[PDB]
Amino acid sequence: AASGTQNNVLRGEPFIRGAGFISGLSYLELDNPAGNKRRYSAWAES
Amino acid sequence: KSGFSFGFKIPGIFELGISSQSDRGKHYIRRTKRFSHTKSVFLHARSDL
Numbered sequence: 613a614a615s616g617t618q619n620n621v622l623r624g625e626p627f628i629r630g631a632g633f634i635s636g637l638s639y640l641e642l643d644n645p646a647g648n649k650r651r652y653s654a655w656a657e658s
Numbered sequence: 659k660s661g662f663s664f665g666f667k668i669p670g671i672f673e674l675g676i677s678s679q680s681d682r683g684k685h686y687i688r689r690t691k692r693f694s695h696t697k698s699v700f701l702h703a704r705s706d707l
């Protein structure tokens with residue numbers, strides 16, 4: 613008899629306060645923990 | 659397995675011989691197996707701008 617249990621839960625809540633570009637950094641957190649350099653520069657310009 | 663034989667003869671033849679053999683064997687087998695696996699993924703997303 614063999615039994616295996618797998619359980620992994622990872623949740624992120626980015627806060628990017630760039631009015632329209634604020635949602636980009638929040639949506640990019642899905643599977644991408646590191647922030648995009650180009651997206652970060654765009655948010656800084658915003 | 660079991661076997662028995664008996665023989666007796668005396669002259670006055672006269673001769674007599676009796677043999678008996680009985681064999682019996684039984685084999686029984688049984689195999690049962692069950693496998694069950696459950697996989698559930700729940701993802702919730704909420705974003706406000």
Ligand SMILES: *[C@@H]1O[C@H](CO)[C@@H](O[C@@H]2O[C@H](CO)[C@@H](O)[C@H](O)[C@H]2NC(C)=O)[C@H](O)[C@H]1NC(C)=O
Nearest residue numbers: 613614615685686687688689690691692693694
């Ligand atoms: C009946 O017994 C046999 C013993 O050889 C079992 O056969 C192997 O059992 C191991 C036990 O984990 C398995 O990893 C192998 O895949 C089995 N091989 C085969 C060819 O089945 C067998 O599982 C038992 N049960 C049955 C046949 O229902």
